[PDB]
Design a protein around this ligand. Sequence first.
Ligand SMILES: Nc1ncnc2c1ncn2[C@@H]1O[C@H](COP(=O)(O)OP(=O)(O)O)[C@@H](O)[C@H]1O
Ligand SMILES: CCc1nc(-c2ccc3c(c2)CC[C@H]3NC(=O)c2cnn(C)c2)no1
Ligand code: VO4
Ligand SMILES: [Mg+2]
Length: 717
Amino acid sequence: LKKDVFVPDDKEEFVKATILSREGGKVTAETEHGKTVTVKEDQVLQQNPPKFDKIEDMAMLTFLHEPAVLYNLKERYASWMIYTYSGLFCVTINPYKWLPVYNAEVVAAYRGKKRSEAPPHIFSISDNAYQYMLTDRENQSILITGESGAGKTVNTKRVIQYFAVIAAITGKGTLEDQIIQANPALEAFGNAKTVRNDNSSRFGKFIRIHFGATGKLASADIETYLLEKSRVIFQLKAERDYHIFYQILSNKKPELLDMLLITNNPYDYAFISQGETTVASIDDAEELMATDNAFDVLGFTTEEKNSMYKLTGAIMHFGNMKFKLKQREQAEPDGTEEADKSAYLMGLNSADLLKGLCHPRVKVGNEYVTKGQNVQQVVYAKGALAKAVYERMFNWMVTRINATLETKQPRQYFIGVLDIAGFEIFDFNSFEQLCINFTNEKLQQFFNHHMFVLEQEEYKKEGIEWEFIDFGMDLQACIDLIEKPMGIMSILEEECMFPKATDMTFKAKLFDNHLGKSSNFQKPRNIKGKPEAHFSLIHYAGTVDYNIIGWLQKNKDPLNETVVDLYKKSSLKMLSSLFANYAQTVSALHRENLNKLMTNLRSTHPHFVRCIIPNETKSPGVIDNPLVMHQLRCNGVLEGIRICRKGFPNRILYGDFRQRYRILNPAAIPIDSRKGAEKLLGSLDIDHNQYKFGHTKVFFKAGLLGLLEEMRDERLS
Ligand SMILES: Nc1ncnc2c1ncn2[C@@H]1O[C@H](COP(=O)(O)OP(=O)(O)O)[C@@H](O)[C@H]1O
Ligand SMILES: CCc1nc(-c2ccc3c(c2)CC[C@H]3NC(=O)c2cnn(C)c2)no1
Ligand code: VO4
Ligand SMILES: [Mg+2]
């Protein structure tokens, strides 16, 4: 009835209510919690009829507003219906539990199904991108958005699983078996426990799934972006180092502990035990087996696996190396056991490593001079080297996985799946958090441009009568602040080329250029107990307080080139190969990666999947209404649905239209492909307002095409 509505609520955003009376521009209502409320007319939103309950596509709702969307999602989620269409894109809510929706019977049933003839699913997104790839002969992209913990990695792995299982119907196993095992292997080394996610991705990735001209699974490749090197040697209070360290220490493979000359205790290793060492949801012993098996399935040799294990163990001993001041400021080893162990594993000479660390060489023409190092300088250098070998080993692994994923099958098109590290806010936000949050901001803007800009531009260039709608979805100001010349990165990069520059001159340069000048740049909110911040940035998903200490060193990433030389001359083949090519700042590389990805993505047909984290307590089935609403708001879910309802989501070239639908009325076209389409459409018993004629394509309102498709099925049968 007109009695069933939604009213704004302080704690739950919106609550259901029954209108009791209407007077003086005000509505009196009882809120389905029993509260009797009086609100203004403009605040009361209509409930959709029971026939629209748990609707699969929210673009079909009679009333479209925030609580209509929120409650449709909540009701579907309560029935463990975790995917929902929102116009031409999909929304998914993290169930925080295994559901029986991803088995091989489910994958087989989705094969070739049109979006509307199957329930909302990641398999349907995957299949429909495959159908467009073969129909349009163009590359596709599956762009999975969300904050840390929302389910991007899970959905990425489900898209891969779909094509590998479909295909099933240079290593140990088949291409299908190897594509499935790539992620367990990368995750042991590139994922870690943070406060928001027990298995947080500490690298971004773009996986291309290659197909031949006829659509047969040909190959796959992975590109990874800026692994969080700092985690190797440093952890905040409620986080862990990379999974692998704890997987090895689990003692599930006693032969590994012996080979690496390590104990079973993570607290004996300084680099890996600054935060937490166990995760309730993770069995590190079983995970070690899964990692080891993944390397086998990917055709890694025993020599390649043992070298990765040895280098992981050597990083552990490297962190335990003690230094003291030389009695007379110059540092000297305070023991040699830990260096001897790490040198043995790294195929180096212990005495050479220690002398290279304390006394690095400075080139003076064709002569050299030893540079002095204090204890702080040595422990910094020792940390920088450990990060470099780890990151280089991870990059080597990705290259090695790619080599096995290369088959002798030709490639025509691909479906690329993007899985970035999601938006996050820690108590301490450093350079990593800026790089991560800037990527999320860029990916949201890619969505805004595609959905709101390119869409309305398409109507304009095709001569469709259209009034431009400003959806309030434009992040160009914040993006420009971070990436354009004289922005945050540009200033950091410039401060990098100055020897007298400090964290405070870089801070001063940021303030002098942007405080009260750039709207998205603000002064921070520092609270008692919580860490100190230097500036705050207004991102799409919230304001983030950034601490700029160490950003100049983080951006330059300097290495002791004397011990890098020793790595190059190592008797361990892998270590020498890791530093073989050793001779840009990390922000310049980040901007380059992003620019390259964004231009390459505009040459693909994108498919958006919006992952939503339901709560902060990893609780299955519980919705924190303000947290879901915030994510739907900053994602532009409502606006994205509005353009599907207000605009013309489908369009077909006249020639392709005349061909496919002549069967609906052959007497109409027994003449030009446009005249044919015009006479064909005009002769059919449809709402002639549901379509518009453009310069090259016929444009359709949501629903007209499906009806035309039903009509084509009836006639062929
Ligand atoms: N569809 C899903 N089904 C089951 N568990 C899921 C699903 N999506 C996410 N999860 C859970 O949420 C956690 C965080 O999800 P993940 O995909 O790693 O997030 P992110 O977006 O940070 O990459 C996972 O470890 C898993 O326990
Ligand atoms: C280009 C598309 C893209 N970038 C990413 C990404 C970008 C940065 C980072 C992470 C992911 C997850 C970890 C973080 N790393 C750093 O900040 C960082 C800082 N110093 N180094 C060496 C790395 N995902 O997707
Ligand atoms: O927790 V995440 O995988 O989004 O980084
Ligand atoms: Mg992830």
